[PDB]
Scaffold this active site. Sequence first.
Site, PDB file in Angstrom:
ATOM      1  N   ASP A  96       0.839  -1.203   0.000  1.00  0.00           N
ATOM      2  CA  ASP A  96       0.000   0.000   0.000  1.00  0.00           C
ATOM      3  C   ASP A  96       0.875   1.255   0.000  1.00  0.00           C
ATOM      4  OD1 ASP A  96      -2.289  -1.311   2.591  1.00  0.00           O
ATOM      5  OD2 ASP A  96      -1.951  -1.995   0.537  1.00  0.00           O
TER       6      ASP A  96
ATOM      7  N   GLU B 162     -14.819  -1.622   4.579  1.00  0.00           N
ATOM      8  CA  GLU B 162     -15.051  -1.622   3.143  1.00  0.00           C
ATOM      9  C   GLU B 162     -16.457  -2.193   2.867  1.00  0.00           C
ATOM     10  OE1 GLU B 162     -10.300  -2.486   2.050  1.00  0.00           O
ATOM     11  OE2 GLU B 162     -11.631  -4.108   2.723  1.00  0.00           O
TER      12      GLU B 162
ATOM     13  N   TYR C 103      -9.321 -10.057  -1.822  1.00  0.00           N
ATOM     14  CA  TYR C 103     -10.245  -9.074  -2.437  1.00  0.00           C
ATOM     15  C   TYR C 103     -10.826  -9.604  -3.766  1.00  0.00           C
ATOM     16  CZ  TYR C 103      -8.843  -5.170   0.783  1.00  0.00           C
ATOM     17  OH  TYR C 103      -8.603  -4.364   1.907  1.00  0.00           O
TER      18      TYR C 103
END
Length: 657
Positions: A231, A502, A614
Amino acid sequence: SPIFQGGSYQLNNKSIDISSLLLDKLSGESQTVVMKFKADKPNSLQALFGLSNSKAGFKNNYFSIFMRDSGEIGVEIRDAQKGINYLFSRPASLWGKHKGQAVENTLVFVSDSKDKTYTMYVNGIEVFSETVDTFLPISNINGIDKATLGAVNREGKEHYLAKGSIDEISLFNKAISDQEVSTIPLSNPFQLIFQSGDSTQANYFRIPTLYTLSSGRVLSSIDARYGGTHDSKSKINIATSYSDDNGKTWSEPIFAMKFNDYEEQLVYWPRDNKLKNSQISGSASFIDSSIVEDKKSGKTILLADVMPAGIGNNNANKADSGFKEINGHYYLKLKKNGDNDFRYTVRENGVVYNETTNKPTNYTINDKYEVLEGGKSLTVEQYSVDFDSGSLRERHNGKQVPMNVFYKDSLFKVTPTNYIAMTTSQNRGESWEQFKLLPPFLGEKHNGTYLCPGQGLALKSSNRLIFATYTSGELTYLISDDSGQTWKKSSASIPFKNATAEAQMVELRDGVIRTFFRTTTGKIAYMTSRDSGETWSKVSYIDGIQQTSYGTQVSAIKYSQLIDGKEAVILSTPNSRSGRKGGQLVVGLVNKEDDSIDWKYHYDIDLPSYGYAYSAITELPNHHIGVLFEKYDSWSRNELHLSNVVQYIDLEINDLT
């Protein structure tokens, strides 16, 4: 051309000896193994193929090709007399099952003595390539006397017993080229949209999205990550690609959002424990995208987070928006080089104005966030990165690029915090406009919210567009009724502090929205609005699906057709309490009386022990389901910096039920 070829061998915890077929044929210092095999119920650690010295006293003299029930593949190359003990591997290299049937994997190992290199491909993908200074041919191990399938014969006993089958195996006394490798036929259950070596020149990808457009075109977006799978802080751009044929083929990627302060380099990021945490530290970046289509205008809209140079989540100023309010309007703040304080704002027509002396300067900011002096474009010198000196170095490369206010070397700089930007396309993803920053939604002294990756929601009966975002204590829905020209917020409190909540939304019936979201409790949560998103209910939890304590993004769609007479919602998530593995699509039937959902079917993406993180899902124009997903554990510090693990598959409703 092969020296040996055999087929249909069944491995049921008993090895097959092939010594008298292979051993006397091995010669010279270079070899290639080609193996087509299935393993849908593997043991914990098992050898598929072995060359050993089986005599007493020589137990550390062998070559093996091994796999783990986590999906990792590797080799050992050991000779006690030469003092060589090589071990090379990569996690999450394998497939297990697809549509109730065992997947045939195609493995190619190349042992090349001229270049001193060992190279492994599985299913067409290079998973490791290792150069050594003292080369050990696999045939040149001291006293080899056995060739074995389904074990390694050590001091007379079967080590690493396998469960599986070898449909086909071939050996060559040659190191075949990368050209010859590409011609070996494959039986893949998956395809690639974004991949190492494409137009992005990023070697890593994370955070997939998928959305079916009104034309029938399917669009995908993703994080093109340059400095390993880290990230922000890092170098990351947002890239896109589309399919005009129900997901059968995909366009060459372009950029939706990109910075030029650092070069776009394809880099092999180190995976050893000393260097794996190396992180690109002077670059600007984008991270986490989301897509929606606007009916009235026909525009496609994409948002993502924006990070200035050297900034990411854990060093971003939490008590500053980056904007100054001057009578209900918000202006981007700037600091000039040599000043200790932010003395400037960007006013109308990009005019750099001095707050301290209340006078306008001779500088301006253009639509691209670049700095002009007296109407003339200022420039900075670009950086490139390398590991040539044994650690990470970031340095000037001699190339001039426009001076941008998100850059490290800029004369005028933005507040070191996180932002959200939007871009639009007027040709369904063929090109993207220059991005614009969104304004703050939670006041002057609050950092930006974090965009939920995946899809926005376009309400069926109106012009309303919604993007979920999160921050500490709440979901912050961003609403636009005018094609993304203006935005307002709608807050929904959640019973968690500092969670990565999320969220993804579905429209159960007109004006009725259910949001499914990640929590810190090991269960997927949900809330409902019957308001078109104006107000939100309290939080409830789904039983029958497990996550880990830190959790994982979940994707969610409303299917267009009836299943068993009822309306249906489909969720995509790992279903495991251990890690990011055991991927499922779960099909829920809606009760028309009370809007409750009966989760009636659970479909196995692959083996429970195989990676799944994900994910993106969409109903394709032909009622098939498209899935683009991270096929590995993206939390694990053992599974960092893998290439081509974000993969695409196609399923039908009858496979799921």
